[PDB]
Design a binder for this molecule. Structure first.
Ligand SMILES: *[C@@H]1O[C@H](CO)[C@@H](O[C@@H]2O[C@H](CO)[C@@H](O)[C@H](O)[C@H]2NC(C)=O)[C@H](O)[C@H]1NC(C)=O
Lengths: 49, 45
């Protein structure tokens, strides 16, 4: 996958996190991307190796 | 019977758990370091 610049690999699943209109991708503890928001739908999806 | 009252101590057992948890939390955090490089995500680079 690539989400507007974020290059990675993993399984995409429906999330239950809430980024506020100013949030684009909440990384987890240990500073690794864990969720993204589509670049033309605004759906929040969890990512996991 | 008084032994339970003194319990309800085990700091030597919690320290073993803490020392390993701290080494695993540090080992993961050391991946977000540039070491004088361009970035830290083997993908960006
Ligand atoms: C960018 O343009 C595309 C055009 O395809 C937009 O996609 C459509 O958006 C409307 C509004 O929700 C939907 O009803 C359509 O079904 C979408 N098209 C398809 C093929 O799914 C998209 O929303 C636009 N993005 C932005 C941010 O404006």
């Amino acid at each position: 996958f690539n989400f507007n610049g974020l290059t990675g690999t993993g399984v995409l699943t429906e999330s239950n996190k809430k980024f506020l209109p100013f949030q684009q991708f909440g990384r987890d503890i240990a500073d690794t991307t864990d969720a993204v928001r589509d670049p033309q739908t605004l759906e929040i999806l969890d990512i996991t190796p | 019977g008084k032994i339970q009252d003194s319990l309800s101590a085990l700091g030597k057992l919690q320290d073993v758990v803490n020392h390993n948890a701290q080494a695993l939390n540090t080992l993961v955090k050391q991946l977000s370091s540039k070491f004088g490089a361009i970035s830290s995500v083997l993908n960006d680079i």
